[PDB]
Structure 1
Amino acid sequence: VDVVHMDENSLEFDMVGIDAAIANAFRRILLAEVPTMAVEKVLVYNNTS
C-alpha cells in the first residue's frame, strides 16, 4: 500500500496487488456500510418560514 496524498478530507493510496473483487468490496463498504450520525426526527414547535 502506497498513499499519494493525505490532506484532511482526502486520501489517494495505491493498494497494489489485490483483485477487483476485494477492491470493489472496500469501495462499496465506504459508500454504504461505514456508520455515521445524522438527523432522523424533527420536532417543529413553530415554523413561520
Structure 2
Amino acid sequence: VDVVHMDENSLEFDMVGIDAAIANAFRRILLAEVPTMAVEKVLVYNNTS
C-alpha cells in the first residue's frame, strides 16, 4: 500500500497486487456497510416556517 495524500476528510492511496473482487469488496463496504449515526425520528412541536 502506497499512500499518496492524506488530510482531514480525504485519502488517496494505492493497492498493488490485489484483485478486482477484493478491491471492489472494499469499495462497496465503504459505500454501503460502514455504520454511522444519523437522525431518524424528528419530533416537531411547532413549525411555522
**After TM superposition, is the score higher than 0.5?**
yes
Question: How many angstroms apart in 2 are the aligned matches of 1:8 and 1:30?
Answer: 17
The TM-score, its normalising length taken from structure 1, stands at 0.97
How many angstroms does 1:47 deviate by? 0.6
Gaps of 5+ in 2: none
What root-mean-square deviation, in Å, do the aligned CA atoms of Structure 1 and Structure 2 show?
0.4
Cross-structure match for 1:22: 22
The TM-score, its normalising length taken from structure 2, stands at 0.97
Cross-structure match for 2:8: 8
How many angstroms does 1:31 deviate by? 0.3
Percent identical across equivalent pairs?
A: 100
Gaps of 5+ in 1: none
- How many corresponding residue pairs? 49
